[PDB]
Amino acid sequence: EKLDFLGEGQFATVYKARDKNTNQIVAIKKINRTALREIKLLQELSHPNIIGLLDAFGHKSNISLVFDFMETDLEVIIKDNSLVLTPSHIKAYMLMTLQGLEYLHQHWILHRDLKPNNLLLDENGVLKLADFGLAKSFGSPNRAYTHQVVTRWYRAPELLFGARMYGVGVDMWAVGCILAELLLRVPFLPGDSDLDQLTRIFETLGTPTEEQWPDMCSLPDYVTFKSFPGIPLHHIFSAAGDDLLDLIQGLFLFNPCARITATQALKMKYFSNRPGPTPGCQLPRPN
Ligand SMILES: Nc1ncnc2c1ncn2[C@@H]1O[C@H](COP(=O)(O)OP(=O)(O)OP(=O)(O)O)[C@@H](O)[C@H]1O
């Protein structure tokens, strides 16, 4: 049962609803084997910080995916919302994202499409991860009708240099970008193009030596960069403490293996150190 239009999305119209009898309030997403597999998986998954797929239904010409409804996403919190202000809140979000991600990884799944608007928050400030992209998005491809800027601003360098093999590091990089967005309140690396995006990565983070990233060059789309010295994280992130700086550190290591994993991240001082995560209805909502 329809109840409201919520927004257009890269690859879906999204509609608030109390689903046929289903009294839970719900968001339906409107748009071939692999896609069916992805649907039944996200479905089979079960984790406090992973979005709930509740049904899919549809006859070839349309698919509709049913997720429990979320107040907002982490973008609207970052975004313009100067009402909202984030300290040590930031710890909570990361705590969740990583746990959410740790689970995903443990379950041999890369969320391949993290960005602030796929880290959703429910009424009670539980952060859940959005559908791992393809689970709609590119899975079943016909694009919506939408405006709104598009966002490759979280691609790891390995994907921008067109690695046709990737892993956890892909997600961990995006998390790094999110953690940045949070602290910076602007997009950390807002590139116009993959190439521009690689520029902003390198002039911010430094150009990686072969010592830092090995195998960096034989990357399919690799093309040579001025050798930028990069800005010391503490100069990018004044707000940041050393413990957090150390997590930003690991998430942005260039070499996808050196790059921190969601578990390893989680075990870092940041998440045990003293300004603990804000309990999360203490976690601020936008209007
Ligand atoms: N589970 C949900 N609960 C509440 N609102 C949602 C939910 N999922 C999507 N939305 C809303 O849908 C709109 C666009 O979201 P969506 O996640 O579909 O964008 P996208 O990830 O770019 O595109 P898509 O997921 O369709 O490829 C936003 O207004 C957002 O508030």
Q: How far is the CA of 9 from the centre of ligand 1 (A)?
A: 6
The strand pair at 64-68 and 53-57 is best described as antiparallel
Q: Tell whether 27 and 109 lie within a shared domain.
A: no
- Please indicate, yes or no, whether residues 52 and 136 belong to a single structural domain of this protein: no
Name the residue among 255, 205, 266, 198 with its Cα closest to residue 233: 205
Q: Hey, what are 124's tokens?
A: 């009670």
- Cα distance between residue 230 and residue 259, in whole Å: 18
Residues 118 and 30 occupy one common structural domain = no
Domain final residue, candidates 71, 88, 122: 71
Q: Which long-range contacts (CB under 8 A, 24 or more apart) does 141-150 make?
A: 141/11, 142/11, 142/31, 143/10, 143/11, 144/8, 144/9, 144/10, 144/11, 144/12, 144/13, 145/8, 146/8, 146/9, 146/10, 148/8, 150/10
Which of 45, 71, 97 delimits the end of a domain? 71
For helices 168-184 and 242-252, what crossing angle results, to 10°? Answer: 140
User: Which residue's CA is minimally distant from atom 21 of ligand 1?
Assistant: 9
Which atom of ligand 1 sits closest to the CA of residue 31? 26
90 and 174 inside one domain:
yes
Judged on CB neighbours under 10 Å (0-12, 13-18, 19+), 27 is buried
Record the tokens describing residue 192, joined without a space.
Answer: 């116009």
Q: What is the 3-state secondary structure (H, E, C) of the chain?
A: CEEEEEEEECCEEEEEEECCCCCCEEEEEECCCHHHHHHHHHHHCCCCCECCEEEEECCCCCCEEEEECCCEEHHHHHCCCCCCCCCCHHHHHHHHHHHHHHHHHHCCCCCCCCCHHHEEECCCCCEEECCCHHHCCCCCCCCCCCCCCCCCCCCCHHHHCCCCCCCHHHHHHHHHHHHHHHHHCCCCCCCCCHHHHHHHHHHHHCCCCCCCCCCCCCCCCCCCCCCCCCCCHHHHCCCCCHHHHHHHHHHHCCCCCCCCCHHHHHCCHHHCCCCCCCCCCCCCCCC
Cβ count within 10 A of residue 107: 13
Are both 109 and 249 inside the same structural domain?
A: yes
Residue after which a domain boundary falls, among 41, 71, 101: 71
Residue 229 and residue 116 share a domain: yes
Residue with tokens 């339906």: 28
- Residues taking part in catalysis: 113
Within 10 A of 87 (CB to CB), how many other CB atoms are there?
11
Provide the token pair at 150: 């598009």
List, chain by chain if needed, residues with CB within 6 Å of any ligand 1 atom. Answer: 6-7, 9-12, 14, 27, 29, 67, 69-70, 118, 120, 130, 136-137
Do 155 and 279 have their domain in common? yes
Report CA(73)–ligand 1 centroid distance (Å).
9
Question: Residue 201 pairs with which residues in a beta bridge?
Answer: none
Q: Specify whether 139 is located in the same domain as 39.
A: no
Mutation test residue for ligand 1: of 14, 31, 38, 123, the one with most atoms within 8 Å of CB: 14
Whether residues 62 and 81 share a domain: the answer is no
Residues 47 and 81 in one domain: no
Distances (CA, A) of 283 to 84, 221, 265: 10, 41, 22
Cα separation values, 237 from 17, 114, 232, 240, Å: 41, 21, 9, 5
Of 177, 117, 178, which is closest to residue 148 (Cα–Cα)? Answer: 117
Nearest to 133, CA basis, from 16, 259, 39: 39
| CA–centroid distance, residue 7 to ligand 1 (Å) | 7
Q: Which of 3, 6, 19 to mutate to test the pocket of ligand 1 (most atoms within 8 A of CB)?
A: 6
Identify whether the C-beta of residue 29 lies closer than 8 Å to the C-beta of residue 12. yes
**Closest C-alpha to ligand 1, atom 13:** 7
| CATH number for 59 | 3.30.200.20
**Protein residue closest via CA to atom 10 of ligand 1:** 14
- 162's CB contacts (< 8 A; 6+ apart) are 219, 220, 221
Single-letter amino acid code for the residue at 197: Q
The answer to whether the CB of 35 falls within 8 A of the CB of 139 is: yes
Query: Domain check: are 32 and 119 in the same one?
Result: no
Same domain, 11 and 55: yes
Q: Are 170 and 156 in contact (CB under 8 A)?
A: yes
Which CATH number fits the domain that encloses residue 113?
1.10.510.10
Residue 60: domain span: 1-71
Q: How far is the CA of 239 from the centre of ligand 1 (A)?
A: 30
What type of residue sits at position 280?
G
CA 17 to chain centre: 25
Q: Which residue has the tokens 């930003």?
A: 248
Number of domains within the chain: 2
Atom nearest to 131 CA in ligand 1: 25
The angstrom resolution of this structure is: 3.0
